[PDB]
Amino acid sequence: SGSPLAQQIKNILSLISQADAAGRMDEVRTLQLNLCQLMVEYFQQGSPLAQQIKNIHSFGHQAWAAGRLDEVLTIQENLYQLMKEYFQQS
Ligand SMILES: [Zn+2]
Numbered sequence: 757s758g759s760p761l762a763q764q765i766k767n768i769l770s771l772i773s774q775a776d777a778a779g780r781m782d783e784v785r786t787l788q789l790n791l792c793q794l795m796v797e798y799f800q801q802g803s804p805l806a807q808q809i810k811n812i813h814s815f816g817h818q819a820w821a822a823g824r825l826d827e828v829l830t831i832q833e834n835l836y837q838l839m840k841e842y843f844q845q846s
Contacts, residue, residue, distance in 0.1 A: 757798050757799065757800070758798075761794065761797065761798050762798065762843060764794060765791070765794050765795070765798060765839070765843055765845075766843050766844075766845045768787055768790050768791045768794060769791070769836075769839065769840065769843065769845040770845060771783075771787050772784060772787045772788065772791065772836075775787060791839075792813075795809070795813055795839070796813075799813075805838060805841065805842055806842065808838060809835065809838050809839060809842060812831060812834055812835045812838065813835060815831060816828060816831040816832065816835060819831055
């Protein structure tokens with residue numbers, strides 16, 4: 757974890773919000789791929805909130821691998837809300 761990584765996570769969270777509002781569906785997909793990688797790197801190796809971000813991210817991968825879109829989507833809602841809290845990015 758680190759401050760430049762934290763700001764890049766905040767940048768990508770902000771662009772996801774902007775791209776979503778503007779209807780840029782392909783860019784949203786790319787942004788979510790970037791956020792995924794940044795989360796793996798930032799949370800490598802914490803507070804209860806950080807532990808739950810890590811757990812929920814892991815279960816998100818398991819749901820995605822099975823194509824379980826219904827569970828992916830509500831995992832995403834939970835994960836992204838916790839990320840917005842941890843990184844103070846509304
Ligand atoms: Zn991921």
